[PDB]
Amino acid sequence: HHWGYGKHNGPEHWHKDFPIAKGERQSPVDIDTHTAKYDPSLKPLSVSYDQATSLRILNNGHAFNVEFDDSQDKAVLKGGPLDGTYRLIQFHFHWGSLDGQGSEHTVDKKKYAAELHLVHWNTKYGDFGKAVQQPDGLAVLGIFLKVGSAKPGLQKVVDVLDSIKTKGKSADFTNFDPRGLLPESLDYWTYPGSLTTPPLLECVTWIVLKEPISVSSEQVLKFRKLNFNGEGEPEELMVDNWRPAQPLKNRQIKASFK
Numbered sequence: 225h226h227w228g229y230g231k232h233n234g235p236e237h238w239h240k241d242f243p244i245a246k247g248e249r250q251s252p253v254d255i256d257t258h259t260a261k262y263d264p265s266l267k268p269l270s271v272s273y274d275q276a277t278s279l280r281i282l283n284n285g286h287a288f289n290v291e292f293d294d295s296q297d298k299a300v301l302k303g304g305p306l307d308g309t310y311r312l313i314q315f316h317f318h319w320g321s322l323d324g325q326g327s328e329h330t331v332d333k334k335k336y337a338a339e340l341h342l343v344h345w346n347t348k349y350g351d352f353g354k355a356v357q358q359p360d361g362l363a364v365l366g367i368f369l370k371v372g373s374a375k376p377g378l379q380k381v382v383d384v385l386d387s388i389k390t391k392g393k394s395a396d397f398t399n400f401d402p403r404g405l406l407p408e409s410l411d412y413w414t415y416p417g418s419l420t421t422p423p424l425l426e427c428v429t430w431i432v433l434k435e436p437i438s439v440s441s442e443q444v445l446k447f448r449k450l451n452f453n454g455e456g457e458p459e460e461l462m463v464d465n466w467r468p469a470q471p472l473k474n475r476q477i478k479a480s481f482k
């Protein structure tokens with residue numbers, strides 16, 4: 225009886241195995257844009273992905289992960305709210321059964337069709353595993369997806385999904401360049417939060433870009449052909465793998481822009 229996104233194992237049940245689900249800095253949240261304050265002392269955000277080296281793509285039974293070789297000083301996030309340097313380890317998405325839902329963060333209660341999470345660990349802690357024992361161990365760059373024009377730089381991900389249709393399948397995926405998934409602007413909101421899947425650890429500085437990327441309906445329809453299930457098991461389409469907004473509990477959300 226593993227956690228998931230269904231009636232009997234979804235987000236309203238996670239607190240039993242993971243009581244931090246009711247913690248003081250859980251994610252995602254609704255971003256109330258009028259209450260977020262501009263912070264002129266945020267330094268510029270720096271996203272340096274030119275030497276990112278992807279290994280592999282994986283269906284882990286809740287989403288798919290695009291993995292990176294994080295053994296060298298490559299693909300780093302710094303600046304903004306962050307002290308020092310954070311190294312990219314993986315990205316994944318959350319998405320809906322319908323274009324009208326799928327994001328985890330919301331913006332004045334608006335749900336986007338999906339949300340990309342680029343996950344980075346603070347290099348002061350040596351690797352991901354020690355970073356997730358720290359309150360400033362991780363930084364996740366979140367990017368909303370809306371349905372409209374296609375995102376050309378997403379198509380190599382879309383096309384490999386047929387080979388990891390089911391849980392536990394992976395495929396070599398070298399030379400994927402995550403620069404092709406960014407929007408033009410790096411304006412963002414930031415707040416302290418958590419992982420949005422079990423174990424829900426409260427390690428994350430969230431950086432959520434204001435500008436969404438556009439993906440086509442056909443691209444997100446191929447996300448929705450994935451399966452929660454393994455090969456040979458009955459089909460449960462991988463859709464609605466998002467956690468809803470959690471209580472803000474007096475945290476403050478800061479804006480990088482006026």
Ligand SMILES: COc1ccc2c(c1)CCN=C2c1ccc(S(N)(=O)=O)cc1
Pocket residue numbers: 313314341343352364418419420421422423
């Ligand atoms: C070792 O590399 C990992 C990459 C990702 C995870 C783990 C390990 C352990 C299980 N948790 C994650 C994870 C990362 C990001 C998120 S999210 N949705 O907060 O970005 C959720 C879970």
Ligand SMILES: [Zn+2]
Pocket residue numbers: 316317318341420
């Ligand atoms: Zn995520």
